[PDB]
Amino acid sequence: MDALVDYAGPAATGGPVARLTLNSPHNRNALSTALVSQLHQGLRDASSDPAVRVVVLAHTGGTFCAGADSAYDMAVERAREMAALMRAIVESRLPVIAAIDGHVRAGGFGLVGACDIAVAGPRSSFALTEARIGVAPAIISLTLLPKLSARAAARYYLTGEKFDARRAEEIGLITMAAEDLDAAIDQLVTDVGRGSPQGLAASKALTTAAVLERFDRDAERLAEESARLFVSDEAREGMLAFLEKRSPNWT
Amino acid sequence: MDALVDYAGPAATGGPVARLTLNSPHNRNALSTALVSQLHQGLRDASSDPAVRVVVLAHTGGTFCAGADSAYDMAVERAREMAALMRAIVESRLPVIAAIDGHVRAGGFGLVGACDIAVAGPRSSFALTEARIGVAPAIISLTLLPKLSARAAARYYLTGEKFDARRAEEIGLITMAAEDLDAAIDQLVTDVGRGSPQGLAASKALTTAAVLERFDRDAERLAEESARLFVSDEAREGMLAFLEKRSPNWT
Amino acid sequence: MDALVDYAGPAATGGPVARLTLNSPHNRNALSTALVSQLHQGLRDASSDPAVRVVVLAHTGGTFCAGADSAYDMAVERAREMAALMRAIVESRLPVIAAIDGHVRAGGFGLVGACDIAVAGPRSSFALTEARIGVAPAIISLTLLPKLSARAAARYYLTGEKFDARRAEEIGLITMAAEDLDAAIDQLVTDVGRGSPQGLAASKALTTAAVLERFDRDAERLAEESARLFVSDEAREGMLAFLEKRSPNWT
């Protein structure tokens, strides 16, 4: 297996499928510049092969993805880079299926939201704790707000509560909870692979049109907001309190 | 009972209700030119009678509706005709309730989506197999995408899986699953009939405004897409493989 | 406790929370001019105090709120006043949580819809009987249509059926049903209060942007519709039939 993203095509998978595996154990599969570039190239390699009709986005280790790896300039570019990665997944001719069995935090939510189908197993957990450190889930709203129920987005954005796979299915964050992740993915890949390349591309595009319109309207405004919050006084205190394990001064 | 659509008014139903029954057994209640014209006239006859406050859309046989009955010109007009029928149901002063106890495929989904309320019994089944024959659910998206959960539309458009009445209720395709269809319809008709003609028309229009805006933006573009897919190379192979019972060449 | 709205701040609540209690027992907590003015002032007093990070909207008695307390001019202004109260809740820097254990009717639905989070206990009931008296749920659509499932809005607007807390959670009208209301509110207030003032305000605004756009487009048109229906012939007969306990003449 390669690092930081491994590619396995039809000759290794035994089907009309490419598997892209996140494999960066040193930082719990964080969204570094190198990992992001390697995901763009992997998606391109899959689309270029006429034998591929579907992609699986998988991971090694106990965490699926825990988020990001003057200060204003670096923060605004990090946000734009997250939007461009999500947009590449949404624009693809190929259906993309997430295979989750581990923790999901921060920017990781944006990957889960961008996939067409998502399945999670019994080790999985989810929490939106942005407000507790002085910020907000701005950029990831591009794929979360079209898919979560209204009442669930408002609850979990404001409470920061941790929840499981069953709750994630109920609210629209994932497609299905499964005790046997491998068996569920194998069945979904079999059924999607029955579709023609033209039929799958056109059927996907019907479901993504409204999502791409939201990116056109809101991506730049949300990137600027993300950066303003990152360099603020309350964000500095929030992160400092976390690293020292004390409570923040507003409490 | 008349063919291809039967009309029963208040003097036969014993209430402030008209029943329109699909009755074309030779082709499993397919959407022929004649059946479509007779549904338009039935909806007009119901609205014209001041004693009618609600319509039930019912069927004979084991199938509710299984879809459609140079080649480009015929295909584009078939798609526009489907949009106009759905739009007539959505624009009516009258609440329209579907009574389903049988199979639903292709264009049949568009009728179910257009109704204000829908109930399905224990013989019912649903499957979106468009991609498996080289096409997409384009025109029917006008009423499916405003009502299905986001995760469910993406799953079932891409997998082609068959599902039951209970699953259809969970995802927003129908209002309720019922073991006794006749008892559930009788109760719903009693409760809707308590409303005044003006109150029911204004209450319905609040819920249909966003749907009619989508028709204004997207109906023509979707009709042109439907026709392009119908006359394509992959669509020809898809239908030929089905009729011979062999697998299509992309597998 | 004060009438018609009581205010309790951090020194009385023992936390970073203000409680606003509806306390107008003579008319079952109806939306009078005085009660509405006192709610605006209470929301302002909470936002002005830097120690407050969340608001609870509570009630005395067995009813949460049962709705409204020449004729055209009075009706159009009543509708605009309802929209402005809902908009004040939606625009606030503070998360607002409803605590319901009683009946909800008419304009009361608009308060429940405007809150960010809503919890209801075992005495609660809900019914949209507008069509039965010749009118429609026009103004309250501003907060109900963004949060209810499509199939549920269409069903309950047209049937007038009564339903409970469990059903209200299923359809998106509330966040959660609870047997012990006080215990559930205490836990939610604890978790929200962990967030910073800036983080909570920015996280809320992401979820309210689409709602405020709907107010901009539709509030005035909906206020004019409300007033036209109020002074109509069918509305006069509907209310007269109710007060005499007879059936209306359209049945």
CB contact under 8 A, C206 and A136: yes
How were these coordinates obtained?
A: X-ray
Q: How many CB atoms lie within 10 A of CB B44?
A: 11
Question: Helices C33-48 & C71-91, crossing angle to 10 degrees?
Answer: 20
Which residues lie across from C163 on neighbouring strands?
Answer: C126
Domains delineated in chain B: 1-179 (3.90.226.10), 197-251 (1.10.12.10)
CA distance linking residue C182 with residue C201, whole number of Å: 25
Residue of A250, A212, A240, A222 lying closest to C202 (CA atoms): A222
**Element at C127 (helix H, strand E):** strand C125-127
Q: Is the dihedral of CA C44, C45, C48, C49 positive or negative?
A: negative
- B23: amino acid identity, one letter: N
CB contact under 8 A, C229 and B117: no
Residue identified by tokens 């028709």 is B215
Could you tell me which chain A residue has the CA closest to the CA of B130? A199
Strands C63-65 and C103-105: parallel
Cis geometry, peptide bond prior to residue A4 (ω within 30 degrees of 0) = yes
3-state secondary structure of C26: helix
Q: Crossing angle for the helix pair A71-91 and A33-48, nearest 10 degrees?
A: 20
Considering CB atoms only, which of B141, B153, B158 is closest to A192? B158
Q: Which of A150, A159, A250 sits opposite C196 (nearest CB)?
A: A250
Min Cα distance C137 → chain B (Å) is 7
Q: What tokens appear for C141 in the block?
A: 């659509």
Report whether B181 contacts B121 (CB < 8 A): yes
State which amino acid sits at residue A17: V
Provide the token pair at B103. 């199979």
| Cross-strand pairs, B150 | none
Q: Is A227 on the interface with C (CB under 8 A)?
A: no
- List the one residue out of A58, B201, A154, A246 whose CA is nearest residue C174: A154
Residues 6 or more apart whose Cβ sits within 8 Å of residue B51: B9, B10, B16
Residue B68 per-residue DSSP state: B
CB contact, 8 Å: A193 with chain B?
A: yes
Q: Rg of chain A's alpha carbons, rounded to an integer? A: 18
The residue whose two tokens read 């993805």 is A65
Phi and psi torsions of A7, nearest 5°: -115, 125
> A39 at the C interface (CB within 8 A)?
no
Q: Which of C172, C197, C199 sits opposite A150 (nearest CB)?
A: C172
Query: Is B158's CB within 8 Å of A198's CB?
Result: no
Beta-carbon contacts of residue C240 (< 8 Å; ≥ 6 apart): none
Nearest alpha-carbon partner for A86 in A50, A151, A130, A138: A138
Q: Exposed e or buried b for every residue in B125-145, given b needs 16+ CB within 10 A?
A: bbbbbbbbbbbbbbbbbbbbb
Q: Do B207 and C131 touch (CB under 8 A)?
A: no
Residue-wise DSSP of B194-241: TS-HHHHHHHHHHHHHHHHHHHHHHHHHHHHHHHHHHTSHHHHHHHHH
Which candidate in B129, B157, B228, B236 is best for mutational testing of the A interface (most A CBs within 10 A)?
B157
Would an 8 Å CB–CB cutoff place B186 in contact with chain C? no
Q: How many whole angstroms separate alpha carbon B59 and alpha carbon C210? A: 40
Task: With beta carbons under 8 A apart, name residues in chain C contacting A161.
Answer: 191
C232 contacts in B (CB within 8 Å)? 198
Instruction: Identify which of C159, C135, C136 has the alpha carbon closest to the alpha carbon of residue B97.
Output: C159
Backbone φ, ψ for residue B104 (5° rounding): -125, 120
CA distances from B72 to A9, B76, B79, B85, B229 (A): 38, 6, 11, 20, 10
CA distances from residue B78 to B70, B84, C164 in whole angstroms, order as listed: 13, 10, 45
Say yes or no: C146 contacts chain A, CB-CB below 8 A: yes
Indicate yes or no: CB of C134 within 8 angstroms of CB of B191. no
Measured between beta carbons, which residues in chain B are less than 8 angstroms from residue C229? 198-199, 202
Task: Kindly determine whether residue C198 and residue A151, on different chains, have CB atoms separated by under 8 Å.
Answer: no
Separation CA C91–CA A204 (nearest Å): 36
Contact between B222 and B138 (Cβ < 8 Å): yes
Residue B9's alpha-carbon distances to B86, C186, C251, in angstroms, are 22, 56, 16
- Distance from the Cα of B233 to chain A's closest Cα (Å) equals 10
Shortest Cα distance from C46 to chain A (angstroms)? Answer: 17
DSSP letter for each residue of chain A: --SSEEEE-HHHHSSSEEEEEE--GGGTS-B-HHHHHHHHHHHHHHHH-TT--EEEEEE-SSEEE--B--HHHHHHHHHHHHHHHHHHHHH-SS-EEEEE-SEEETTHHHHHHHSSEEEE-TT-EEE--GGGGT---TTTHHHHTTTS-HHHHHHHHHH---B-HHHHHHHTSSSEE-SSHHHHHHHHHHHHHTS-HHHHHHHHHHHHHHHHHHHHHHHHHHHHHHHHHHTSHHHHHHHHHHHHTPPPTT-
Which sign, positive or negative, has the C-alpha torsion A25, A31, A33, A36?
A: positive
d(CA C101, CA C181): 8
Q: How far apart are CA C49 and CA B125, in angstroms?
A: 58
β-sheet bridge partners, residue C177? C120
CB proximity under 8 Å: C 56-115 to A: 95
The shortest C-alpha distance from B171 to chain C (Å) reads: 10
The B residues from 124 to 143 touching A (CB cutoff 8 Å) are 130-138, 141
* Widest CA span in chain C: 58
Tell me which amino acid residue B62 is: G
Across the interface, which of B16, B146, B200 has its CB nearest the CB of C131?
A: B200
Q: Rounded CA gap, A67 and A69, in Å?
A: 7
